[PDB]
Design a protein around this nucleic acid. Structure first.
Lengths: 101, 92, 124, 119, 73, 53
RNA sequence: CUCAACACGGGGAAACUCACCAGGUCCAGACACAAUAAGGAUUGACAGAUUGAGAGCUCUUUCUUGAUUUUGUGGGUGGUGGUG
């Protein structure tokens, strides 16, 4: 066994929560202690451009947002089952990093 | 271009070796990242090839994209190499 | 006719062009000879005033480990034997320019079509 | 009678440009603290070589330059410099009380106003 | 902007055209057949006895170097 | 010619430029974006910058 | 140039930005044809003059380079040049 940590980061809520659900579902398929998904505060990345090219018109402003959702799950597992669970749950839009200790 | 002959050789061989060059639209860019020559030489050598045929260029986001055509792969053989060698990704 | 009548110097020189050993022109060759990387000299039938005659083989007939020379005829047709003049759209050649010293440093080359030239020099 | 910050004028000329900066203001001290590779030798070679032209008579030949951003040091005293205002070089004789000043302070870059009154 | 005045003196002047002299490669020739060095070679290890040092006035200057080889004599 | 591009470009608007059109006016370099104001507005959707509120 | 120009051009410009002014380099003029041209098409340069300038700019000088250049004819390319 070894202490591991899996960190998930995405811009899509629906594509991320089911991946963490698959992580925990594989976690109590063969039981081991969870320290389940601790959701970090969502990050809103704001870009406020004006509206236009050249400055003619009313001074209208836009704001654009990208939302970063982050989740980390702190597991412990035997060395064998680590690789398979880190490789099965791979989905577009979700970035998964695994810290060894 | 003056472009001394030992720098045509580096440029032309690498175009034969892979079949593609991208090379970074920036003149006076001081030693292009892949070939050991200047980046100005890479851009201007393959402009000479394109006007006569032999390569097709695409430009996007301050970058060029050079693709060796079938009339240029045969020509670049006797310039640098012997026959029965495959330049492009035609090698399986 | 049968095999060759002094026909072998071209394929000596064609394999010398492709491996950048042929120093066409005098000033590269005259400076090639003075530092000892010339293996064959083939200059001219005739020039004016014999100004460059004794200058070339004076560097070739020096008695230190090398006397290379053969001879050649008039240099206007040596331009085709050098790299000067392209195919020029199914013509004989391009507008060929002058000649009358070409010197090989290294051949990067092979058998009899080159080899029998050296027996013409190592033997008489 | 003339002294810069307590040292006499005849002490100024018999003193290297490094020792002058050690009593200069903070801008002059900062510039030559980070003044490596400023290329100062091309201009200054033409100043001493122009002092040999005039043995004892009137002011030497002008040495025209573009460097408006160059601090006057005591080795420049007595020379005459043509300072580029942007289109024209203006000869200005380097008076001893010009120390610590920039060459651009003595070559104006604009003809001022003359508002109206065509005369 | 309507035209150009060119207050500078009327200089469409160009470089020296890599000045075209006659044939010049001459060590010297004696009778039958030897040759000896004139305008002697360089002390550079990367100049392998093939370069001519110009002598302008009390200077020896190599052209294999971009700028400067000064073995003055 | 050793003076050709010799002026330093290490800060200020002359060094940086857009990565799409190579302009110097209206650049956005928040989060290392390096895209002009007008270029970013045409492809904010592709980057993932949508407009909610 | 009324609202619908005037802390607006994301325009808080010391250089750069830069489009303007006084000046100096470079071609980054592809390709095709014709000419020069291996008795050298051409390229670069120490020192001095000269230059704001350690710009071989250009000149004095005499080395280097070697067929890519040069010249001419057509074009090509670029333009924060014009016309919103």
């Amino acid at each position: 066994i070894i202490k591991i940590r899996i960190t998930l980061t995405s811009t899509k809520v629906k594509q991320l929560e089911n991946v963490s659900s698959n992580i925990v579902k594989n976690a109590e398929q063969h039981n081991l202690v969870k320290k389940g998904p601790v959701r970090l505060p969502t990050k809103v990345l704001k870009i406020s451009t004006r509206k236009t090219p050249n400055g003619e018109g009313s001074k209208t402003w836009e704001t654009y947002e990208m939302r970063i959702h982050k989740r980390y799950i702190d597991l412990e597992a035997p060395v064998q089952i680590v690789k398979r669970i880190t490789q099965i749950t791979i989905e577009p839009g979700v970035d998964v990093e695994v810290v060894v200790a | 271009m003056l472009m001394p002959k030992e720098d045509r050789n580096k440029i032309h061989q690498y175009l034969f070796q892979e079949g593609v060059v991208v090379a970074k639209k920036d003149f006076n860019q001081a030693k292009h990242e892949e070939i050991d020559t200047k980046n100005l030489y890479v851009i201007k050598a393959l402009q000479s090839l394109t006007s006569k045929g032999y390569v097709k260029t695409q430009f996007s986001w301050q970058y060029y994209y050079y693709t060796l055509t079938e009339e240029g792969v045969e020509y670049l053989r006797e310039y640098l190499n012997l026959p029965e060698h495959i330049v492009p990704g035609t090698y399986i | 006719a049968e095999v060759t009548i002094e026909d072998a110097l071209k394929v000596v020189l064609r394999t010398a062009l492709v491996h950048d050993g042929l120093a066409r022109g005098l000033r590269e060759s005259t400076k090639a000879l003075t530092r000892g990387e010339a293996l064959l000299v083939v200059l001219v039938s005739s020039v004016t005033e014999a100004n460059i005659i004794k200058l070339v083989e004076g560097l070739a007939n020096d008695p230190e480990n090398k006397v290379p020379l053969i001879k050649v005829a008039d240099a206007k047709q040596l331009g085709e034997w050098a790299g000067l003049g392209k195919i020029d759209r199914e013509g004989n050649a391009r507008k060929v320019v002058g000649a009358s010293v070409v010197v090989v440093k290294n051949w990067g080359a092979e058998t009899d079509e080159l080899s029998m030239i050296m027996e013409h020099f190592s033997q008489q | 009678t003339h002294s810069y910050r307590g040292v006499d004028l005849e002490k100024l000329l018999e003193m290297s440009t490094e020792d002058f900066v050690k009593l200069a203001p903070a801008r002059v001290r900062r510039r030559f603290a980070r003044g490596m590779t400023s290329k100062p030798a091309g201009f200054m070679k033409k100043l001493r070589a122009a002092k040999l032209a005039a043995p004892e008579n009137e002011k030497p030949a002008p040495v025209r330059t573009h460097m408006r951003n160059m601090i006057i040091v005591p080795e420049m005293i007595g020379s005459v410099v043509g300072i580029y205002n942007g289109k024209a070089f203006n000869q200005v004789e380097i008076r001893p009380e010009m120390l610590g000043h920039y060459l651009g302070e003595f070559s104006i870059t604009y003809t001022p106003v003359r508002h109206g009154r065509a005369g | 902007r309507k035209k150009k005045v060119y207050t500078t003196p009327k200089k469409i002047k160009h470089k020296h055209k890599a000045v075209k002299l006659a044939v010049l490669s001459y060590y010297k020739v004696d009778a039958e057949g030897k040759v000896t060095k004139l305008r002697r070679e360089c002390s550079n290890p990367t100049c392998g006895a093939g370069v001519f040092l110009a002598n302008h006035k009390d200077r020896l200057y190599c052209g294999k170097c971009h700028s400067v080889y000064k073995v003055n004599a | 010619e050793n003076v050709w591009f010799s002026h330093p470009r290490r800060y200020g608007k002359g060094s940086r430029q857009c990565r799409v059109c190579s302009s110097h006016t209206g650049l956005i370099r928040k989060y290392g974006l390096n895209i002009c104001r007008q270029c970013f507005r045409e492809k904010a959707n592709d980057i993932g910058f949508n407009k909610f509120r």
